[PDB]
Amino acid sequence: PQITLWQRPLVTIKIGGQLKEALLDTGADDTVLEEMSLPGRWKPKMIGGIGGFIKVRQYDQILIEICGHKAIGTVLVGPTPVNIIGRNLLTQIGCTLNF
Amino acid sequence: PQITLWQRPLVTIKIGGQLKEALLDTGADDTVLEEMSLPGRWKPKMIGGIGGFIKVRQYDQILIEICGHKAIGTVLVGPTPVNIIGRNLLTQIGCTLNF
Numbered sequence: 001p002q003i004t005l006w007q008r009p010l011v012t013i014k015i016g017g018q019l020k021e022a023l024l025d026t027g028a029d030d031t032v033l034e035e036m037s038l039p040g041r042w043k044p045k046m047i048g049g050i051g052g053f054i055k056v057r058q059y060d061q062i063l064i065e066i067c068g069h070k071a072i073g074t075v076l077v078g079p080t081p082v083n084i085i086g087r088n089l090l091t092q093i094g095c096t097l098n099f
Numbered sequence: 100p101q102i103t104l105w106q107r108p109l110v111t112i113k114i115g116g117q118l119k120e121a122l123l124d125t126g127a128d129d130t131v132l133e134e135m136s137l138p139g140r141w142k143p144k145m146i147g148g149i150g151g152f153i154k155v156r157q158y159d160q161i162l163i164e165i166c167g168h169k170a171i172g173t174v175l176v177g178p179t180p181v182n183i184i185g186r187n188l189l190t191q192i193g194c195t196l197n198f
């Protein structure tokens with residue numbers, strides 16, 4: 001699709017079999033979801049937000065669908081203001097900014 | 100332009116006679132710049148996300164040029180770690196997400 005930005009670009013994602021609402025965030029380098037169960041081992045990751053850096057859990061090679069587009073990549077889990085699809089997965093699904 | 104998300108979508112803007120680098124950020128409702136002077140009235144606001152909240156000054160009806168595109172809108176000014184062009188101005192230059 002072509003998504004305008006008059007409203008937040010909230011889309012449905014599917015991960016671990018569940019539908020969730022997430023924000024397409026080109027300012028986020030990474031993908032960070034609210035606390036959830038993901039398979040496997042995780043590694044530590046620091047993400048720098050507006051108020052400073054925080055520790056989150058990094059899970060690699062996770063299947064996630066974004067508006068029906070299948071992706072497999074790194075998903076961080078932590079206390080994000082909203083589920084966020086950041087550039088790692090936006091790139092994967094072929095998303096660009098256009099004006 | 101069509102801007103890839105392999106890297107951060109950093110652009111040059113011109114605001115208040117200053118040339119700055121800023122991130123095209125679809126996750127940001129409003130534009131947020133590092134401390135600078137702007138003309139006119141302002142009112143305080145708090146904005147936040149990962150790591151917490153910061154206080155900013157909200158200036159409305161500010162002229163920004165983004166990639167040669169003029170746009171008018173609110174600019175939040177405060178101790179942000181990165182200059183952000185949010186949806187309030189992305190819309191004005193006709194910026195969309197595309198995949």
Ligand SMILES: NC(=O)c1ccc(S(=O)(=O)N(Cc2ccccc2)[C@H]2CNC[C@@H]2N(Cc2ccccc2)S(=O)(=O)c2ccc(C(N)=O)cc2)cc1
Nearest residue numbers: 027028029030047048049050086126127128129146148149
């Ligand atoms: N209310 C408003 O207008 C408003 C609020 C908040 C801001 S913001 O400054 O925080 N801002 C820009 C920014 C800040 C720091 C670095 C790059 C970009 C958010 C938009 N894009 C990412 C930011 N974040 C996501 C977010 C915050 C709030 C609402 C929706 C989305 S986040 O939680 O800092 C985060 C950071 C980084 C990562 C990562 N590494 O993936 C994930 C999450 C601007 C405006």
Ligand SMILES: [Cl-]
Nearest residue numbers: 043044045055
């Ligand atoms: Cl840890």
Ligand SMILES: [Cl-]
Nearest residue numbers: 073074088089
């Ligand atoms: Cl990835």
Ligand SMILES: [Cl-]
Nearest residue numbers: 171172173187
């Ligand atoms: Cl505005």
